[PDB]
């Protein structure tokens, strides 16, 4: 008779139900991040609702405000670890045991993991369907006060339609990458239009936040190796991953994927060791000084961690490292410009202006490290919708003459 | 007969007038920062104003836009090297030359020496009264393509009266600072009240933009021996340096103060390796989500590099590291206050929302790190002035309930 995997761990396993039933008012419960959400475990909490709670997350529930606790992404496993963000519940999805007893984070390290080694109680959601990812992203299960067992295919997304402006603004970041670069960017249209345009370049190497489709299907094609990579070569690192279910199964067991958590992949002294580091991400708005305004609201994304700027600065020590925002230049159905003259009232600046290096959209690349003010709002200005430019044009005047 | 020690030199030594005279029009001079700005060429400069020219600086003229160029200020040399921000004419004051044919920039270091390592034309204005100081802060005076002879007291402060505003942030201040420590902070009533509550204190050290007259007056006390640094142990490392006429004695020739270039002290990754940083620093205002304006206009101050991120970007990494952004609670004469529910029409934010640390006021500390946006807001509703508590306690509401 073959063995029973789960046998020896029969006496903490439990059903959702059980597991979160062990939560206290007034707890802070953290759940493993983006497409990892442990869903038997959330289900269950919603069940409960009546009785109970504050869930630490960083997704933008929504898309794709008073709990809310501005940090660096890459601070937050040291902020928990210091009991400074204080978490009383890890509720963590992983991969099945190996031999040895270590389940893996799958798709989420992040701060998941942190969480998970820091929490009074920690729940391990294992589903059969949650891979095994390599990296510093096991636990041993020993470590674990609950297990609930789950079988069930993990949250994918679809690639999204690419339009023209899209597409201009992806031509315009592959014009930006040169063959070796280091790349970091994420999922949407913008992203993706990148990467189609990168079939030309030769050993691109991956150290980013996430990755999804769009970069295992360079990989696939040959033009993301890691070979030319400072750090980690040969491997694509990042934190967590999103994406269809053809990225779950390439990631299952793969060597050459590796996740690490947070406070090691987003630290800017990490990230400015990947020479020729090229960085991508958006933002709702950019003022014609060059301050950067990324919040959840607008932004039509599933995961709001704030990472960008950690890779705005890590790029900035990147030997010939870029870091790009590109945007469409308009929103709200072309009714509204993202280059702004002043930002929106009561926004959050997320990038310095001091700190922002390109700018892109559709009608081109602006690049503001080294411009005076003026320089920079006409810079900006050049590459704002048409219909907008007149009005830019009269505050760069009021403002400057 | 004596040896006349310019006579080898006489070649190239000319009037000021003589040597502002090989600038050409629309060409970006560079001059010593703060007060080593060497005005004998300035005075030169402003006579035959009629025939020329941009000025590169970092004063705030009219305390204590157009041109204006934002940029992080450890990252100007690098900028100035690789020709992002060019300078065409570096006029640099310095000390007389030693045996060795070398002159140090005396008090201003900074971007000054890296101005004077870069530009096409250099000019020396060489004054008996500037003091030569140690550290990485000499050039040959071969590279000199013009030198100035000068004998003039360079630019000093006098110490401001301290109020009973300043006396209660001063004293909160040295709350936060333990024996050990190692400083950075500024000049004004603030910073010396500060160092007026320190004469308890064991050990500490200075890595620091700058210091001035109460920095010294803690080292002839004893209290300053930077003797548990863990850089540059023994020694007050800094990049420019003001104070009074006896300030400047005190530093001439003496090897306990060494500058080095602005790439080199103010680069977050140099200031993390002082343990135990506390870093002090102002601003205009702050907003309820923590944001942080610092501008020259309303600052009272004459050096405006905006150089204190970069302190709070190095405490971050610092071992028990803090940033403090010390500030009356209230400006124009009481009519306003500092901590507001939005920050002003087109402000520039200097310190992001997720790194502002500790905020000070006569009113009393709050730490940012860690707490929600309702947190943020009603730590720093406390600690501002009773008259402005009412308007941003229903701000608050209005955001929160
Ligand atoms: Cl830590
Ligand atoms: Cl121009
Ligand atoms: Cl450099
Ligand atoms: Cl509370």
């Given amino acids: 008779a073959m063995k029973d995997v789960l046998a020896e761990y029969a006496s903490?396993?439990?059903?959702?139900?059980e597991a979160v039933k062990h939560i206290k008012n007034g707890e802070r419960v953290a759940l493993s991040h983006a497409a990892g959400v442990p869903?038997?475990?959330?289900?269950?909490?919603?069940?409960?609702?009546?009785?109970?709670?504050?869930?630490?997350?960083?997704?933008?529930?929504?898309?794709?405000r008073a709990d809310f606790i501005p940090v660096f992404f890459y601070e937050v496993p040291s902020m928990i670890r210091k009991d400074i963000l204080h978490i009383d519940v890890a509720?963590?999805?992983?991969?099945?045991?190996?031999?040895?007893?270590?389940?893996?984070?799958?798709?989420?390290?992040?701060?998941?993991?942190?969480?998970?080694?820091?929490?009074?109680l920690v729940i391990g959601e294992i589903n059969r369907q949650m891979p095994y990812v390599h990296g510093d992203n096991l636990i041993h299960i020993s470590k674990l006060d609950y297990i609930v067992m789950a079988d069930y295919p993990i949250y994918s997304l679809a690639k999204p339609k690419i339009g023209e402006v899209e597409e201009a603004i992806g031509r315009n970041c592959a014009e930006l990458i040169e063959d070796g670069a280091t790349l970091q960017l994420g999922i949407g249209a913008i992203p993706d239009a990148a990467l189609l345009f990168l079939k030309d370049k030769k050993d691109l190497g991956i150290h980013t936040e996430m990755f999804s489709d769009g970069v295992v299907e360079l990989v696939r094609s040959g033009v993301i190796t890691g070979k030319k990579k400072t750090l980690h070569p040969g491997k694509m690192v990042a934190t967590f991953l999103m994406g269809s279910e053809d990225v779950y199964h390439f990631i299952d067991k793969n060597p050459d994927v590796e996740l690490y958590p947070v406070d090691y992949v987003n630290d800017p002294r990490v990230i400015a060791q990947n020479d020729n580091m090229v960085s991508i991400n958006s933002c709702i708005e950019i003022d014609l000084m060059g301050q950067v305004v990324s919040e959840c609201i607008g932004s039509k994304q599933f995961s709001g961690t704030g990472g960008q700027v950690d890779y705005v600065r890590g790029a900035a020590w990147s030997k010939n490292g870029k870091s790009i925002m590109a945007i469409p230049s308009t929103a709200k159905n072309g009714t509204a410009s993202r280059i702004v003259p002043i930002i929106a009232e009561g926004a959050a600046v997320t990038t310095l202006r001091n700190e922002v290096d390109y700018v892109v959209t559709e009608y081109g690349i602006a690049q503001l490290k080294g411009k005076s003010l003026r320089q920079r709002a006409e810079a900006l200005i050049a590459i704002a919708h048409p219909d907008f430019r007149e009005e830019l044009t009269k505050h760069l005047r009021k403002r400057f003459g």
């Fill in 12 to 17: 903490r396993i439990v059903s959702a139900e």
């Fill in 39 to 64: 869903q038997s475990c959330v289900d269950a909490l919603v069940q409960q609702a009546d009785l109970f709670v504050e869930i630490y997350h960083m997704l933008c529930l929504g898309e794709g």
């Fill in 91 to 120: 509720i963590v999805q992983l991969s099945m045991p190996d031999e040895n007893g270590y389940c893996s984070f799958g798709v989420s390290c992040d701060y998941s993991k942190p969480a998970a080694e820091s929490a009074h």
